[PDB]
Design an enzyme around this catalytic site. Structure first.
Site, mmCIF file in Angstrom:
data_model
loop_
_atom_site.group_PDB
_atom_site.id
_atom_site.type_symbol
_atom_site.label_atom_id
_atom_site.label_comp_id
_atom_site.label_asym_id
_atom_site.label_seq_id
_atom_site.Cartn_x
_atom_site.Cartn_y
_atom_site.Cartn_z
ATOM 1 N N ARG A 37 0.137 4.489 2.980
ATOM 2 C CA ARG A 37 0.333 4.265 4.410
ATOM 3 C C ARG A 37 0.751 5.481 5.247
ATOM 4 N NH1 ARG A 37 4.260 -0.404 4.755
ATOM 5 N NH2 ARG A 37 4.481 -0.160 2.466
ATOM 6 N N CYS A 93 0.813 -1.207 0.000
ATOM 7 C CA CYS A 93 0.000 0.000 0.000
ATOM 8 C C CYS A 93 0.851 1.264 0.000
ATOM 9 C CB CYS A 93 -0.927 0.005 1.211
ATOM 10 S SG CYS A 93 -1.845 1.542 1.408
ATOM 11 N N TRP A 96 -9.172 6.347 -0.273
ATOM 12 C CA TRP A 96 -9.559 7.037 -1.492
ATOM 13 C C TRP A 96 -8.636 6.635 -2.638
ATOM 14 C CZ3 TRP A 96 -8.188 9.872 2.948
ATOM 15 C CH2 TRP A 96 -6.858 10.324 2.975
ATOM 16 N N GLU A 111 -5.246 3.969 -10.570
ATOM 17 C CA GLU A 111 -5.989 2.743 -10.281
ATOM 18 C C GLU A 111 -7.144 2.626 -11.260
ATOM 19 O OE1 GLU A 111 -6.462 1.385 -6.042
ATOM 20 O OE2 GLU A 111 -6.081 3.501 -5.570
HETATM 21 C C1 HEM Z 1 -6.184 6.514 2.381
HETATM 22 C C2 HEM Z 1 -5.933 6.439 1.068
HETATM 23 C C3 HEM Z 1 -5.315 5.184 0.408
HETATM 24 C C4 HEM Z 1 -4.680 5.193 -0.771
HETATM 25 C C5 HEM Z 1 -4.426 6.438 -1.649
HETATM 26 C C6 HEM Z 1 -4.248 3.836 -1.066
HETATM 27 C C7 HEM Z 1 -3.542 3.420 -2.179
HETATM 28 C C8 HEM Z 1 -3.317 2.097 -2.503
HETATM 29 C C9 HEM Z 1 -3.008 1.569 -3.813
HETATM 30 C C10 HEM Z 1 -2.864 2.390 -5.117
HETATM 31 C C11 HEM Z 1 -2.856 0.246 -3.693
HETATM 32 C C12 HEM Z 1 -2.534 -0.705 -4.858
HETATM 33 C C13 HEM Z 1 -3.825 -1.473 -5.129
HETATM 34 C C14 HEM Z 1 -3.877 -1.937 -6.560
HETATM 35 O O1 HEM Z 1 -3.210 -1.297 -7.418
HETATM 36 O O2 HEM Z 1 -4.591 -2.937 -6.845
HETATM 37 C C15 HEM Z 1 -3.079 -0.130 -2.304
HETATM 38 C C16 HEM Z 1 -3.007 -1.405 -1.759
HETATM 39 C C17 HEM Z 1 -3.371 -1.832 -0.487
HETATM 40 N N1 HEM Z 1 -3.883 -1.027 0.533
HETATM 41 FE FE1 HEM Z 1 -3.933 1.076 0.429
HETATM 42 N N2 HEM Z 1 -4.647 3.017 -0.023
HETATM 43 C C18 HEM Z 1 -5.323 3.810 0.900
HETATM 44 C C19 HEM Z 1 -5.908 3.356 2.063
HETATM 45 C C20 HEM Z 1 -5.846 2.094 2.616
HETATM 46 C C21 HEM Z 1 -6.554 1.647 3.810
HETATM 47 C C22 HEM Z 1 -7.515 2.548 4.623
HETATM 48 C C23 HEM Z 1 -6.218 0.360 4.036
HETATM 49 C C24 HEM Z 1 -6.657 -0.595 5.179
HETATM 50 C C25 HEM Z 1 -7.224 -0.205 6.329
HETATM 51 C C26 HEM Z 1 -5.285 -0.034 2.992
HETATM 52 C C27 HEM Z 1 -4.681 -1.261 2.855
HETATM 53 C C28 HEM Z 1 -4.153 -1.763 1.683
HETATM 54 C C29 HEM Z 1 -3.817 -3.150 1.441
HETATM 55 C C30 HEM Z 1 -3.952 -4.346 2.414
HETATM 56 C C31 HEM Z 1 -3.296 -3.201 0.006
HETATM 57 C C32 HEM Z 1 -2.803 -4.476 -0.717
HETATM 58 C C33 HEM Z 1 -4.007 -5.149 -1.357
HETATM 59 C C34 HEM Z 1 -3.637 -6.436 -2.048
HETATM 60 O O3 HEM Z 1 -2.580 -7.063 -1.732
HETATM 61 O O4 HEM Z 1 -4.445 -6.829 -2.927
HETATM 62 N N3 HEM Z 1 -5.082 1.042 2.155
HETATM 63 N N4 HEM Z 1 -3.352 1.036 -1.612
HETATM 64 C C1 LIG Z 2 -7.228 -9.994 -9.446
HETATM 65 N N1 LIG Z 2 -6.663 -10.085 -8.105
HETATM 66 C C2 LIG Z 2 -5.903 -11.273 -7.738
HETATM 67 C C3 LIG Z 2 -6.841 -9.035 -7.177
HETATM 68 C C4 LIG Z 2 -7.920 -8.154 -7.293
HETATM 69 C C5 LIG Z 2 -8.091 -7.116 -6.376
HETATM 70 C C6 LIG Z 2 -7.179 -6.933 -5.339
HETATM 71 C C7 LIG Z 2 -7.377 -5.805 -4.342
HETATM 72 N N2 LIG Z 2 -6.268 -4.831 -4.366
HETATM 73 C C8 LIG Z 2 -6.756 -3.527 -4.858
HETATM 74 C C9 LIG Z 2 -6.783 -2.455 -3.781
HETATM 75 C C10 LIG Z 2 -6.577 -2.774 -2.437
HETATM 76 C C11 LIG Z 2 -6.620 -1.783 -1.450
HETATM 77 C C12 LIG Z 2 -6.849 -0.458 -1.807
HETATM 78 C C13 LIG Z 2 -6.886 0.544 -0.840
HETATM 79 C C14 LIG Z 2 -7.117 1.851 -1.253
HETATM 80 C C15 LIG Z 2 -7.288 2.134 -2.608
HETATM 81 N N3 LIG Z 2 -7.498 3.402 -3.048
HETATM 82 N N4 LIG Z 2 -7.253 1.143 -3.515
HETATM 83 C C16 LIG Z 2 -7.037 -0.135 -3.151
HETATM 84 C C17 LIG Z 2 -7.009 -1.123 -4.133
HETATM 85 C C18 LIG Z 2 -6.106 -7.815 -5.222
HETATM 86 C C19 LIG Z 2 -5.933 -8.855 -6.134
#
Ligand code: HEM
Ligand SMILES: CN(C)c1ccc(CNCc2ccc3ccc(N)nc3c2)cc1
Ligand code: HEM
Ligand SMILES: CN(C)c1ccc(CNCc2ccc3ccc(N)nc3c2)cc1
Ligand SMILES: C[C@H](O)[C@H](O)[C@H]1CNc2nc(N)[nH]c(=O)c2N1
Ligand SMILES: C[C@H](O)[C@H](O)[C@H]1CNc2nc(N)[nH]c(=O)c2N1
Ligand SMILES: [Zn+2]
Lengths: 413, 408
Positions: free
Chosen positions: B110, B107, B279, B284
């Site tokens: 963070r 993420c 947000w 994305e």
């Molecule tokens: C506050 C604004 C936030 C922004 C701008 C943001 C941004 C991002 C982005 C761009 C990703 C990549 C996801 C993708 O490309 O599929 C991501 C992943 C992730 N975020 Fe954040 N995020 C935010 C808030 C949060 C919050 C509130 C949480 C949890 C309480 C969180 C937990 C995670 C986790 C666990 C991933 C990895 C997801 C995965 O492995 O599929 N994020 N974030």
């Molecule tokens: C197809 N596949 C295996 C798959 C699909 C979806 C995901 C989910 N991750 C996308 C995500 C997580 C957290 C986010 C937090 C904030 C944000 N602004 N955006 C966020 C976006 C992971 C894996």
């Protein structure tokens, strides 16, 4: 380790199976509790260490030519064993040297251009004794590889390390690079990447033009001797002035680049033998020049100047003015090269070819080590197919390795 | 021992000590790196984890070895014994959730980790209850465009037979329709799920941007369909600031990204339903959602309207069209006063965050493969930033899709 590892392409759902990783020989830097995949970089071999390394390689060579277990195989093993025993080293045959160089490239996990691995012209320079001779060999390399614009990949291999106090080294990181000059006012003229090596050259006697695009001389070390300076004949250095198909003001930026990328600071390892001087060359992927050389803050850093001329709002970063200038600069690079008939490949073509290559390698070889962090281009990553492609990274041998810069270790005579 | 990470632009070197705290595996070995692979209890297992987490909680509030600490240890001990599980205090729940965010190596957002509204929904017992809690989440988080990070936490796992699951992958996603002619209307990523909703009694409007219904499972029971009241669903029409023809593409996206399929793990406890939301970073939507071949796939279409030469790849027509799409997304959200961050600003903030974490925490696990934005990578600061990836707990983990594990 499990015999079969799966990799998935997340945009085609294609699943490949890797068995080749079992032949891994060097460590990656990762452990079970920490991944170092985004880390850039995570007195000789003895008889006992050398015996198994050589055998491993020889077996591999003979397995490749479908002569494994043959009379010639066992004879070669015995002749190598004899040499290591009597001379604590050994000499590769020309066939093995060529095989080994090609496989070092094939094994190069960071290289997106490996589909070409088997067409590599190998120049055996193991009879070289002096820096003038190195210079003759390197000049011939450049001319052959350049081929008036129709670039051909090539490598020149100088004598292997013996005791470590007689190394052959090219002190240049690439055979052709532009100088960087540090100004008393803190500004940099030319290429900031090359400032240190430029200073070394100057201390060694080079009279610098002090321009933006001055080609650096070669700094060549033969047989552990002090390095010597040589100017590459200017006609051997093919160059491309950068212009834009749409923007007539782009040529007014006075930009150019050299046609031949020619890494010369790596170490080629084959059967436990160390070739500390092995300059190799292919051809450019456009992004290498357009994104990194030109748009990196610590390189030519021209995004702003290009942005001004495009008349973009450069106040709100959310206008993406940086991204927009970046694309144009890269369009121009590909246009200039293609217009001068100098081989270059765009990041879309290169990455598509690599997926094809990788699929073929898994098919015929049981795998294809790849470093995603390096394979994915520095712009528009997700709109290239390598971005969605799972890759396993592992170090096979023969290989190209990094080695310390020679001025850090050289004992000046 | 200690590990240095270099930024190859500023030449700043940070030192990681925090990684010594990890116990979970990453999947790599000394000889194979799986850094780009997407996916690499009992009372006996439960106590040392509970103990470890209680220990770091009381260690974080500067009361290690306190009376409250010892009592809590005994308390948890007694409870795991008598019941095969235990219940987190409210404070610990909040700490646990903020820290799972803080430890999320993938993420880039963070910097915000400690500003997280935590909604305790552990008294939930039905899908109707879940729906109510979820609706409140959406409304709170959306906040008329001024988005606020939030997480809603449903009852932890007990026996695997009574899981709470939000079946939707995000709370708000558009439907995907598999057409007669083999093509796809809507969003191809959700095609499967979209059709499990139809199968359950959903009446698809069959448009490009149909908000999917919620499908909620409480205590192991069958999922139930719920329409999110439309006035809770904030949406943004996409237009371009110079290209007055962009509006005519008829593109829109929702404002609230709310991941709802992950598993929250705290102190050995498993929260299989914990929808969280923040947000959007513009890429994305603009890069992945719209331009991926296996998603909305609009580059071709946009490239037409810009009258670009599309015969050879080396005209970088895809690259040009991509930049304009992302400009448009940022412009629309901003003009609608809806929170969004551009990848330049987001990456800057992340580096700053990294610096804070090394200073006060001894490191920051980070996954370069995920942190680097999917466009213009090397003109963002993170591209040049070496990062160490490793697994700290509490964490968000993946879990299987519910339809591959649920009997009816
Ligand atoms: C506050 C604004 C936030 C922004 C701008 C943001 C941004 C991002 C982005 C761009 C990703 C990549 C996801 C993708 O490309 O599929 C991501 C992943 C992730 N975020 Fe954040 N995020 C935010 C808030 C949060 C919050 C509130 C949480 C949890 C309480 C969180 C937990 C995670 C986790 C666990 C991933 C990895 C997801 C995965 O492995 O599929 N994020 N974030
Ligand atoms: C197809 N596949 C295996 C798959 C699909 C979806 C995901 C989910 N991750 C996308 C995500 C997580 C957290 C986010 C937090 C904030 C944000 N602004 N955006 C966020 C976006 C992971 C894996
Ligand atoms: C034929 C055309 C070739 C193309 C288009 C190509 C493409 C590339 C690119 C884009 C990189 C990343 C370089 C960077 O970001 O600095 C790279 C790295 C690399 N290439 Fe290739 N390459 C070619 C030929 C070769 C040849 C002939 C060899 C060796 C015989 C080779 C071996 C390597 C190695 C070892 C690296 C890693 C460099 C490092 O770790 O610093 N490549 N290549
Ligand atoms: C920032 N830094 C520490 C750094 C910089 C440069 C390098 C060296 N790789 C440059 C290279 C290698 C192989 C190439 C092959 C073909 C090609 N067309 N181009 C190639 C370019 C390593 C490290
Ligand atoms: C194969 C590779 O791991 C996969 O495509 C990853 C790459 N990096 C990513 N980065 C983000 N932010 N989101 C993703 O889905 C992915 N996908
Ligand atoms: C920190 C990171 O490892 C570093 O900036 C890498 C990223 N990926 C790269 N990829 C390529 N092809 N070339 C590079 O120099 C780098 N640099
Ligand atoms: Zn790894």
């Amino acid at each position: 380790c499990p015999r079969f590892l799966k990799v998935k392409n997340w945009e085609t759902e294609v699943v490949l199976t890797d068995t080749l990783h079992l032949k891994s020989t060097l460590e990656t830097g990762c452990t079970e509790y920490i991944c170092m995949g985004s880390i850039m970089h995570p007195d000789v071999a003895t008889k006992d260490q050398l015996f198994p390394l050589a055998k491993e390689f020889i077996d591999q060579y003979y397995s490749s030519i479908k002569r494994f277990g043959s009379k010639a195989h066992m004879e070669r093993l015995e002749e190598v064993n004899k040499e290591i025993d009597t001379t604590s080293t050994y000499q590769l045959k020309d066939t093995e040297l060529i095989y080994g160089a090609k496989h070092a490239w094939r094994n190069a996990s960071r290289c997106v251009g490996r589909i070409q691995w088997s067409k590599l012209q190998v120049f055996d320079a193991r009879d070289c004794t002096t820096a003038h001779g190195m210079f003759n060999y390197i000049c011939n390399h450049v001319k052959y590889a350049t081929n008036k614009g129709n670039l051909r990949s090539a490598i020149t291999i100088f004598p292997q390390r013996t005791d470590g106090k007689h190394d052959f080294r090219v002190w240049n990181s690439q055979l052709i690079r532009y100088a960087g000059y540090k100004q008393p006012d803190g500004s940099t003229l030319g290429d900031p990447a090359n400032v240190q090596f430029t200073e070394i050259c100057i201390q060694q006697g080079w009279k610098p033009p002090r321009g933006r695009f001055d080609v650096l001389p070669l700094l060549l070390q033969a047989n552990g001797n002090d390095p010597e300076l040589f100017q590459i004949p200017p006609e051997l250095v093919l160059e491309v002035p950068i212009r834009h198909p749409k923007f007539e003001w782009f040529k007014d930026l006075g930009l150019k680049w050299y046609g031949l990328p020619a890494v010369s600071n790596m170490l080629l390892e084959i059967g436990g033998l160390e070739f500390s001087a092995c300059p190799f060359s292919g051809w450019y992927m456009g992004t290498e020049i357009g994104v990194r050389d030109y748009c990196d803050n610590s390189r030519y850093n021209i995004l702003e100047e290009v942005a001004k001329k495009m008349n973009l709002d450069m106040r709100k970063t959310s206008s993406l003015w940086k991204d927009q200038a970046l694309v144009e600069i890269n369009i121009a690079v590909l246009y200039s090269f293609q217009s001068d008939k100098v081989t270059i490949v765009d990041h879309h073509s290169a990455t598509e070819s690599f997926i094809k290559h990788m699929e073929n390698e898994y098919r015929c070889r049981g795998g294809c080590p790849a470093d995603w962090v390096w394979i994915v281009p520095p712009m528009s990553g997700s709109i290239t197919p390598v971005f969605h492609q799972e890759m396993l990274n592992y170090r096979l041998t023969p290989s190209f390795e990094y080695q310390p810069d020679p001025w850090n270790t050289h004992v000046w005579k």
